[model samples]
Target: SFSGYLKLTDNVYIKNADIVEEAKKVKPTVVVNAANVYLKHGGGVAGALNKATNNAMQVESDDYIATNGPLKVGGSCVLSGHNLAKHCLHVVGPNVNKGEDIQLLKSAYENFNQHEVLLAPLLSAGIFGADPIHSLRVCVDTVRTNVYLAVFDKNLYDKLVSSF
Candidate 1:
């Protein structure tokens, strides 16, 4: 079965697709990488993005960290996408193991509310161990850009579509 999409608002959309692949098709837009505080594109969505961009993103990520220091939880920064897109917004969501922090996750989502079209993943839902449903809720409530949320899993797409 083919999973469809959800229009949460006039500006926000949720698509059942791979963020990396979909993002490559757009120009003059930004892609959100669910990066760590250090902006390490090491695993999960970050790793996929790094691999897709031929590891150039990881080099940029390392450079950002070396200069600015570790990004605070819920903080974000922008870097060149290296042929993947116009830019990549590196955001850090709450690591639930540290504590229950809905505010931090919301802050991360809010950072994407800039004037641009963006493709993003449900933040902190993989190795960071955040609940996907909760993260989705925060995303819809906070992000105000022309955003396409790229949900990769069939089940996750179903749940997110139904939730809205």
Candidate 2:
């Protein structure tokens, strides 16, 4: 699904999509499937921090339950709505400097016991401050799992993928 909206308070337009077409072009060996993607109001720093903290907390709590025993990691998993996945990874994409992306990713690694890995896209040109390629490189360096970049640039898709 794709979404677009204009915010009066910030006077900026927001757009987001599944990016599945772009992902396919990337020819990633792995595809991370998620039920939802959320963007907080405002762009850049402010929104990034808000989402990172909130999501981190949620992941932590769920992790605690899974580790404490008696709770089966499968059917006993806690989630906000009806969905079935061995695990759910919440990806946070915004300026990395604005929040602790590494910590969030580490916590996610520790908590969820399923085969799910969540990642945030690199904050890049047209959205954040850094160049697109550089931003993607930064994310790639930090996280060990297959990283996914949420972007719409046709050129970028060509650059990152082996086949389009």
Candidate 3:
């Protein structure tokens, strides 16, 4: 359903495509994973990408947390993107049940400054249960230039377009 890239600002953009597929299209410096503190890659964007990459990332992620400790909410960690990109940024956003503020979500994007060209899913808006449009708006507002918010679901994409 991806027609093409949709402009958000002069530099930032949004894409309606699979996050992993879009990683291939753009070959970004890194791909952001909407991850849990455990870096489990067990579901949502994280799980699908892990499956697509033949479970390589989970092995590395396991080692990363073993050494670095669990990912903090709103903090991030990185591991090899395997064949997907140069690296994968594992960012832990606020879970709805945690009653955290949007600033936690904003902090997650702030970490994206580590990579120049990057593709990200709507962080915290999936199994984490954040408000979809507000989560997306945080992503659009905070990411640096050359970032793409990859909204894979058409319903969410339509809602975003309608809201703007």
Candidate 4:
């Protein structure tokens, strides 16, 4: 489960790589930023994404969190950035920290997908902090993709393969 693909639904495929590296390669027309309502854009998944894309995520995402958000558990919004050109879908949850909520996780992914190709973390892992096992389940369950291919880290890719 490295540098390739794994299946979720018959059509929903999960791809693997450091999210930013993979995002650069595919330059997915769209990606989701999984973060707290604060959108602090530092540490855990938020930090990596912000580092990869530079301050675009830090500035834009933080601003959104302050003014427009602290989005409810499953709430989201369409977003943009100062640097990276890819459109963003911003989400807040699985929970504010390491916790479990399949419903919220599903709703987050539910708000993302389409564009044929997408780049998203297995949202409930790392930063947002839900059980990895439950994360993949809701991830597969919610995708409304027209054969969507998404990118995430190795643990997500491995679990997805094992689950299938």
Per-candidate TM-score against the hidden true structure: 0.90, 0.34, 0.91, 0.79
Which portions of model 3 miss their true places by more than 4 Å? Answer: 1-3, 98-100
lDDT of 3 by residue, 6-97 (tens): 88776567777899888776667788898989889888899988987899999888988899889889999878888788888888898886
Tens digits of per-residue lDDT for model 2, 11-126: 11212323344333333333232211222224343233224345553454445546653331112223331121223233333334443333233333232224333322333334
lDDT of 1 by residue, 28-127 (tens): 3688889888877888899999999899998888887888899889988988977777888888998886674757898888888864677788988977
How many clashing pairs per prediction, in order? 0, 0, 0, 0
Q: Mind sharing the TM-score for model 2?
A: 0.34
Q: Write the residue-wise lDDT of candidate 4 on 1-164 in tens digits.
A: 22466556665666665666666666666666776666677776667778877676777766766787577667677676334336766667666354546577777777766445466776766656566667666767777663334445566666667766
Model 4 earns a TM-score of 0.79
Ranking by TM-score: 3, 1, 4, 2
Question: Which candidate number would show the highest lDDT if scored against the true structure?
Answer: 3
The best candidate by TM-score is 3
Cα RMSD (Å) per model? 2.9, 12.8, 2.3, 3.4
lDDT of 3: 0.82
